[PDB]
Amino acid sequence: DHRGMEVAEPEVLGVEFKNVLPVLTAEHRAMIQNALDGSIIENGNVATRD
């Protein structure tokens, strides 16, 4: 759960980026973070769903 939206945990995506994180510029870090909590669960707030 994040800001009224249900998003996917970075684990269900398709990437190994943990390696990179430590060398990131405050800027780059931020960008990526948004991309992460960017990918949402489309339908999200619906319940029922399936």
In the complex, minimum distance from the CB of residue 9 to other proteins, in angstroms, rounded to a whole number: 18
- Interface residues with other proteins (CB under 8 A) are 3-5, 40, 42-46
Q: Which residues contact 10 (CB under 8 A, 6 or more apart)?
A: 36
In the complex, minimum distance from the CB of residue 47 to other proteins, in angstroms, rounded to a whole number: 12
In the complex, minimum distance from the CB of residue 23 to other proteins, in angstroms, rounded to a whole number: 29
Of residues 4, 16, 17, 8, the one with CA closest to residue 36: 8
Query: How many Å apart are CA 32 and CA 21, to the nearest integer?
Result: 9
Q: Which lies closer to other proteins via its Cβ, residue 17 or residue 42? A: 42
